[PDB]
């Protein structure tokens, strides 16, 4: 497994896309994958080390351009709606 990287995970019995991160929430010894409101896969327990991993949807958002105006200049500035600065050059 790879942590803190967007990957197409295929865990035991369930398939989906997202990111894998370190967990703090603790499961019960008989449970497999967690959930939250609206019944979406929020966390998955590792079958190997009995560890838990949270699942976050892949980073996405709409871009936006800061333009002072054609008649005043040509410089622009591009804005992504909600993205960490580390993973901007993906697309």
């Amino acid at each position: 497994l790879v942590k803190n990287k967007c990957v197409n995970f295929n865990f035991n019995g369930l398939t989906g896309t997202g990111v894998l991160t370190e967990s703090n929430k603790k499961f019960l010894p008989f449970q497999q994958f967690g959930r939250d409101i609206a019944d979406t896969t929020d966390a998955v327990r590792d079958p190997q080390t009995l560890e838990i991993l949270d699942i976050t949807p892949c980073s996405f958002g709409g871009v936006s351009v800061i333009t002072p105006g054609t008649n005043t200049s040509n410089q622009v500035a591009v804005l992504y709606q909600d993205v960490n600065c580390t993973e901007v050059p993906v697309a």
Binding site: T40, P57, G62, Q81, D82
Partner: peptide, 25 residues
């Protein structure tokens, strides 16, 4: 402020912050 309680990110839905933050309001 403390008397109001329950807006989460999802697959295709987002939430944009207001222009005027709470402190400036």
């Amino acid at each position: 402020f403390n008397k109001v309680t329950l807006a989460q990110k999802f697959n295709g839905l987002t939430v944009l912050p207001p222009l005027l933050t709470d402190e400036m309001i």
